Amino acid sequence: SQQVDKIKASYPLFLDQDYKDMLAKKRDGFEEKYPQDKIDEVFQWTTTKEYQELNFQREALTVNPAKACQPLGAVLCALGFEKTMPYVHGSQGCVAYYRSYFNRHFREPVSCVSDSMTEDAAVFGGQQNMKDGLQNCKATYKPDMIAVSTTCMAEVIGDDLNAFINNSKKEGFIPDEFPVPFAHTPSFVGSHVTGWDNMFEGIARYFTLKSMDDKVVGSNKKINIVPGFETYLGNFRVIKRMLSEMGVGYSLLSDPEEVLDTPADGQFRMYAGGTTQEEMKDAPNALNTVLLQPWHLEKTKKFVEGTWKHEVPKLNIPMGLDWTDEFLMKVSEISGQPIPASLTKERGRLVDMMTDSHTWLHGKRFALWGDPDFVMGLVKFLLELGCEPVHILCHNGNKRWKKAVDAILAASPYGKNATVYIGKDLWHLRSLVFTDKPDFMIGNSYGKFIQRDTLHKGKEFEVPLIRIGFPIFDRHHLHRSTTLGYEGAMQILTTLVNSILERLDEETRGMQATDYNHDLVR
Amino acid sequence: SQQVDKIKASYPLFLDQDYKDMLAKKRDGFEEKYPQDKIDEVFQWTTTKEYQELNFQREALTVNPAKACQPLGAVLCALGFEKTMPYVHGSQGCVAYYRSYFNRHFREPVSCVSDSMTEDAAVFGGQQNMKDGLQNCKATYKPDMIAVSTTCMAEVIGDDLNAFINNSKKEGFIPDEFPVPFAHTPSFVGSHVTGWDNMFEGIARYFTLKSMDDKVVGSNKKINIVPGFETYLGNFRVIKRMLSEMGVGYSLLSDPEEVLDTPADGQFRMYAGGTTQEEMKDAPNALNTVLLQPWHLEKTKKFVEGTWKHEVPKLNIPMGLDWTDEFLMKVSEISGQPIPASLTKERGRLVDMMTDSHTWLHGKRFALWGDPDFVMGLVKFLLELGCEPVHILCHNGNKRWKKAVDAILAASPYGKNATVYIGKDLWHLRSLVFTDKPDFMIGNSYGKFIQRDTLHKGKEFEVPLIRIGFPIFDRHHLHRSTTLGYEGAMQILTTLVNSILERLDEETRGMQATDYNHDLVR
Amino acid sequence: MSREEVESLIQEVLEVYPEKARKDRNKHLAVNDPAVTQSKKCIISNKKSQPGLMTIRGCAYAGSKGVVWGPIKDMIHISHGPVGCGQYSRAGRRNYYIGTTGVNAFVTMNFTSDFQEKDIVFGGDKKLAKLIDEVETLFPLNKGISVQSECPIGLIGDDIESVSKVKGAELSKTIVPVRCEGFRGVSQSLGHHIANDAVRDWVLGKRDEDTTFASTPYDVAIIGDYNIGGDAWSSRILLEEMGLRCVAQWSGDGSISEIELTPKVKLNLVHCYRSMNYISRHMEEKYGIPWMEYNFFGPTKTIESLRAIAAKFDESIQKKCEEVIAKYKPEWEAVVAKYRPRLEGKRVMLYIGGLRPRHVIGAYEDLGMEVVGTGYEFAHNDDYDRTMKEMGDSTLLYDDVTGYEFEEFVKRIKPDLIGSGIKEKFIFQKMGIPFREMHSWDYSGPYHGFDGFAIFARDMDMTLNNPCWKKLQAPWE
Amino acid sequence: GMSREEVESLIQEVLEVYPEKARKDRNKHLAVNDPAVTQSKKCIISNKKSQPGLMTIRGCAYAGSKGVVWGPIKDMIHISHGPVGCGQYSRAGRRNYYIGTTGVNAFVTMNFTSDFQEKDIVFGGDKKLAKLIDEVETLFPLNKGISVQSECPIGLIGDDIESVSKVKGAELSKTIVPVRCEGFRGVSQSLGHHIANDAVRDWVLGKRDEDTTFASTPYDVAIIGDYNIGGDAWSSRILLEEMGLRCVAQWSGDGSISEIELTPKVKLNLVHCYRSMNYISRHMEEKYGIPWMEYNFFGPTKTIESLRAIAAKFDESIQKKCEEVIAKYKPEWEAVVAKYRPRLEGKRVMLYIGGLRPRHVIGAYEDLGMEVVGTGYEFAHNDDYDRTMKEMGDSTLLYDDVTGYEFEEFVKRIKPDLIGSGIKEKFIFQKMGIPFREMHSWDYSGPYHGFDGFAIFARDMDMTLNNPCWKKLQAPWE
């Protein structure tokens, strides 16, 4: 039933007695459910060290992964280029998923096409799909560039992207001069970040490989910035803001911040902003190329060093205090620009906030996950805050990266109780937060189910989630945030200390029981 | 007892059984405490409509006010002037409190002096305190200006600030050219916002009244901006940013953003930034003067119009979409500058966020309080979001202001269930959130005790607090936020929608009971 | 718009295409005509999508794993292949259930074989068998396993049927191989059919032909309700208030045991004809169970359905049917009285998957609204036949609409409201057109039944009449 | 590391900034400790007015009465009588912890005020106060007494709150306590303590002089002058009762009016804060013959000495339980020392606080190997300075009613590793790169009293002094 002036959605509608009785009858009648005592027994078992040991013995089964597949990153990379249509050669179901995944994180349109290869292509290949697909895409959506990647079906069948695109131009389906950079992006290799690396390197090759003869390193007095797979609008913006404040000439290579934030003003803009083709063509003339997320830009690095002859600086992601300092000092060295008073003052405002909040942050224990560069920068900043990053999980991490993070941990007393995990998933992490309980999780929306599980054991065992990462689907507009630079460090610090204080308020809100410590001032 | 490697602070130390037993023994033996059944009975009574009616019958008793006293505002106004020391003539206890109050909100030093009038000066006046105090303050702290206000002791005894300052200069305690603007700021009149108006008009007078002969309206091509009592750093910053983006010459009169945000870089800066004396002296040459918080700038308005001959525009505080639009259009009219594409795009990004979040905001019911201009802007923006501002409380509001807010409510369907209260306090508001329960409160840290009270009645009756206002003492760095302009509207929108979704996650986190609605995507 | 105006719009939009695509798309766009009732005389459907045109369709894995199998709550469903498909489809569809997740229910979890290149080179059958053992060790209360094949599985020559047969016999477990690779078919649709055949061959054919269960003459199954936001629960309650016993729900909140009891019911009640007509026809042929289509969107259809269902039973059920209608009459009448004046006259365009583009029209009409265009991602001609009966004269019909077509149709027709999916939502909001998600219900619902109609009306009103829509144009433009 | 001669020239250099009158006055309030001089009245002046315009850290008598002594009493309602500021700025800023149902049977963190308007200045507030009392009784029926805490205007306009308290108290058979703590009285918080003590004596303490129904034991004590900051009094009480004593009353942290009224029945008054409550303690000895003794529960060395000295006032059974308590907690505080003393030893601290802690916490710092190189008080008297020179090291700097400028320049020269002071000081010294701990509010931590408090104190000094933030203030490029 409903009361017209107080309509109930599913929650709390289904808590009405009649729905409750109906659901109990469905269970008892037809579901052959295990008895509640048995469910409780098995749940308790899943929180134990014994279960954790079985859990960590898994070899073949993955449960609740913390990564996606290559083409997702290729799509995000391509979206950062001016009037560029991401085009995934292969099966169309993949493209529905990439678009929806990004739709839900950015709350924005996400344009991408497929060429709709079907079972028949397993006999004759996808060449005709490429010819008609490129022609149809160009005519219908009028991009100035189509950036081609692949789904796993096309990789297994073995379609030669280079040959198919060349023949599409030869046979007149698209103009010869029309830019169609490409990359093979097999989902069974690496993860979404690898697809970003592959797509970027393909676009870089497209515009520079056969024209290096006239290039002179440093001739355009700019620094190239490669952001990698990046899903916070504030991160593209803070980098451009800081370089502009220093008077540093730069080219942000893959810049989707406009197309992922168009105004609702009465018209839909399929394309906005982005890196220009000319910026890619001119990129070898820069002083140098800086990679903001080097641990998933290894192929790009080899190309800019091997072909453009740039000496890519050895810089960590500019997260936290030390690594933002290092980023700006290296940029100052390359460019000849001093670090200006505005950034020096911003830096000292961050340090001030650290002194202001250090007593509530000190010793706080965290489990956290994400992509390798994000994760290591979060670990570094936590150490700088006097926090303990106890469970550090990077599903798509590698041994060399883990050694780097273990070195960072070993250089700080706040790393003494921390372990770095690679190849492990959120079912692994769930075990760790039961057996070695931290104070909070820093992670993406999939962490909400871990928090749910911990609360089920009891309120004293609940581990609250702090949402920093990708994807975030169950809160609105956090994709506008910043995590890089001093600005992002300030935002992270604020979110962390206030999550601590919100939870303390919750635990001290009990009248006469715990509210002796429900202080007005903290 | 303590275990060395997991030391307990008061919470949860005193939940140990030995402290629990000790506290029960203290109560039973010596506290002669009313029995728990009686406490439960009285508590339940305090949540009823019967109690609310008695509560709203108070005339002499105030409980949990939502306002402070005049000199607090005079001090904040004075801090916005370059190398200016706030100086409160009267009793020193007041200054200890003003400083600590702002210290706790800004987490920053707050410099202010007293001239330490004692019971003896209650019989011969405080002239000598002013002479030695001005000389001592100037020599010790080296301000370029001393801005003098009064505590209630000084007002009752009747000290003539103008004569006392003039005599200090006559007798050589401070140089005749040294600026000593003053204002009488009796705490038994108005509230803290009244002290801001009084102090500002006193400073404006000091620098312009006897120099009007050479002034020509519009000759400096600037617009003066008077911010009023303002405790978000982001609000000073967004106004300056928007006017700079528009290419509008302006003078922000009272600008404390630098002295409330000095970097921690190894030195303490007693003064930083601020409006210069030259800017005040030149202000009559501006095209006009815009008051950002007109409902507490009435005295300033009379001086600006009566002495500077400016035609102050009829503008509401620039909060929310419509009122930011109106601010920018009026600034465009005055200055001749068109609204630039950057601000038009920012506006459309706010509108986009509104379209994205409207389904969770719609119909949500709020209780809220604050100063008059802040409250009416929050009310306006809530209506624009499709929210219902059910309980609107302004302790220091007046009848003419309430009529204005009631007209805003009448223009929207979302105001049909809303009431505006003036002269009422947070103990009145506690009653309203029991008898006519809203979904959330928007208010300052004092609201935490209302949330506590509502939870004690039951989780289903709990009204969570969303902290927007002044003072915020129990979270860190929210004073860096913004509430004005499109940027402030974006921040407010995000905070509100995510408070809603956080609460819904809490209510759906119960496994097998309510987690059918614990959606990953919202 | 007018018939002649709509035909002119179609031709104008199609001018942008190359000739091959223009000729194809023309076949998938039509203007409804009362004289033409057979859709195979006016529109083509269930054909391949044209490359590069930004179809909104998904794949057969979405139709099998995402739609049919994933909701079954006490089984573990393995996304077998590389990591993407299973991650993008983790918990995106609001197929609601009661359970203790990770312990006895598994719906919002992502179990995957996370294929690496070594698995392409050597095959994944050995990994699959080891994975099944690991599932049994860590999730002992699971009541069955399904294997949802992603694109590589068939292409590399793996034999998941052999693994399922061998491991099932070794472990005494129901293990269901599903060849729903996304390269098969042209959309989600073939995934439905593949998934129905897997239920037939591996679940009903393996645990559904000897009773011990106590039958009654009023036993029914809800076929094709995936309980989006609780839709199936707000339907079940009405059927049982009418005196029926809902033995099974396929697949929302569905247990494997209730599915296996279904061959014992007296009547299959089909909501989503597209996705489960196949198994319904099978159960009639093999068990003699009749099936009938019904519609629980809005009071008019819900009342008609209840009466039509009750007429298949006896006088006691028909009496209880009229009791249910009388009970809820004041409730839905109050909804209409409040919301119909706020919505009447407004024009709606819909684009959804295989059922709702026609099934929700009655509910819109119960609020005085008019559906001026509708279409489907993956419907067949039998669906279009049913649609022309529900849609008005001269309305626009689009099959497998392209992104460009949909935008251009909207710009010309200027509907007051659009109901479609997540990939469409943010486009039309930017255009200043109120939008409601008609897959996920925009995180609201249920919309089925009487209790769902209240929510549907609230939702259409909150969005169509919201103050945000008058704010898109700056006063200075 | 500064010599007496360097300290002296530091004092002279700093005072060069001042006009002559301020220079001559401030020189009297700054001194270098000398063990050859034990009488503070031969080396430092105190409890005098502040000089105008120098940015004293002091508060006022209302702070000392309402904020400090009366406010914590949990089952009475305390009216801030005057305009709205005093009561609002002092609402819930002091962590005088208590158990109760706030708004129902306890009222500590609430702000009751008469919110004076100009009409009240002109006509007086006595009629408003009587109406306010009736409204309090209607809306807060479980209150067990009312105090009236006068703000500046009350005495200046000639109001008579004593008569109002007399009449309404008789009418309603209720204890209504008039307190003339107007902030223009005295020179600091100190006179507010004394006024507040006299108010308890005159209106509360004698209520049960003629009753004989309380059941006394030989081991009845009262904790005098512990306001339970962060639970300090509870972490002291537990030890006294483990030692076999019965803590009849706590003045006034977590204190009820009844336990105040029962205090004349105890055998011994245990005075922690001498400054704020020596007055009532002397009264109770003279009138009731109750002896009083000073003690110190900061750190294990002082706590152990205090427990033994208190137990020596009773019989062998208490002395035996004393040694049991000491043995019980020995391994616990020893583990705290083992962990934290190496991390803190040799570090130098400057303190500036109110009337007690500037000397009382020194032993706790020394138990962690630290050195207090400077200390001072806002409002202490010469008897406090006498006790301070005994606790402080040779040649250390002492400052009475220090000015903001003085504290800053002293810190710049002495360069302490840690500063312990208040909220108005905290953010200055953090910006200078000097670790800071709040020593009034315990920086929202504590308790610090007793054995359980020492663990928290040690954890807190360590977390701050050794924090990574302090190495980061200088940008690498400057």
Ligand code: ICS
């Ligand atoms: S009462 Fe006094 S200023 Fe003895 S007014 Fe002050 S809670 Fe201080 S050094 Mo705040 S004489 Fe208590 C004090 Fe000491 S408020 Fe607390 S810390 S031990």
Ligand code: CLF
């Ligand atoms: S059409 Fe459908 S969704 Fe596409 S693959 Fe095929 S079954 Fe799956 Fe999963 S992993 Fe990624 S998304 Fe694909 S490319 Fe390799």
Ligand code: CLF
């Ligand atoms: S020394 Fe002390 S704090 Fe000062 S007034 Fe006097 S008792 Fe009070 Fe309350 S209201 Fe404001 S702060 Fe004063 S000026 Fe009128």
Ligand SMILES: [Fe+3]
């Ligand atoms: Fe600060």
